[PDB]
């Protein structure tokens, strides 16, 4: 029961790292050069 | 049209200001996609 | 008890892959062209 609990702590920051990354991914789209894809 | 549906769906704020300098234009402002 | 332990090993590299990715995501922001978003 100690083993699963540190995995939950190892998972809770893991998704927390991802949410910081996913917000950062939107910043590439927020500021990028798109002149070839006029569409 | 489709540029505005693209740019507004992603927060590209500067092109959103650029396309909306057309005054008295509202038909493309509230048009829908598929 | 063997099953959870290999999952911890399968999780430990998984976050390790993400931290290498998250540092790489910052490099896009570190070197990118932003001339349309003068703001």
From Swiss-Prot, chains A, C:
Residues 2-31 form a coiled coil. It is found in: Cell membrane. The gene is TRPA1. Homotetramer. Interacts with TMEM100. Interacts with EGLN1. Interacts with the scorpion wasabi receptor toxin at the same site that electrophiles but in a non-covalent manner. C-terminal helices from the four subunits associate to form atypical coiled coil structure; this region is probably involved in binding the inositol polyphosphates that are required for optimal channel activity (in vitro). This is Transient receptor potential cation channel subfamily A member 1. It comes from Homo sapiens. Belongs to the transient receptor (TC 1.A.4) family. Ligand-activated Ca(2+)-permeable, nonselective cation channel involved in pain detection and possibly also in cold perception, oxygen concentration perception, cough, itch, and inner ear function. Has a relatively high Ca(2+) selectivity, with a preference for divalent over monovalent cations (Ca(2+) > Ba(2+) > Mg(2+) > NH4(+) > Li(+) > K(+)), the influx of cation into the cytoplasm leads to membrane depolarization. Has a central role in the pain response to endogenous inflammatory mediators, such as bradykinin and to a diverse array of irritants. A 1,2-diacyl-sn-glycero-3-phospho-(1D-myo-inositol) binds at residues 6-12. TRPA1 activation by electrophiles occurs though covalent modification of specific cysteine residues in the N-terminal cytoplasmic domain. Hydroxylation is required for TRPA1 activity inhibition in normoxia. In hypoxia, the decrease in oxygen concentration diminishes the activity of the hydroxylase EGLN1, thus relieving TRPA1 from inhibition and ultimately leading to channel activation. It comes from the Eukaryota. It is linked to Episodic pain syndrome, familial, 1: An autosomal dominant neurologic disorder characterized by onset in infancy of episodic debilitating upper body pain triggered by fasting, cold, and physical stress. The period of intense pain is accompanied by breathing difficulties, tachycardia, sweating, generalized pallor, peribuccal cyanosis, and stiffness of the abdominal wall. Affected individuals do not manifest altered pain sensitivity outside the episodes.
């Amino acid at each position: 029961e100690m083993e699963i609990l540190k995995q939950k702590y190892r998972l809770k920051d893991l998704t927390f790292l991802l949410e910081k990354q996913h917000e950062l991914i939107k910043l590439i789209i927020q500021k990028m050069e798109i002149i070839s894809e006029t569409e | 049209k489709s540029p505005l549906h693209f740019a507004a769906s992603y927060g590209r704020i500067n092109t959103c200001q650029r396309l909306l300098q057309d005054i008295s234009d509202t038909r493309l402002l509230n048009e829908g996609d598929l």
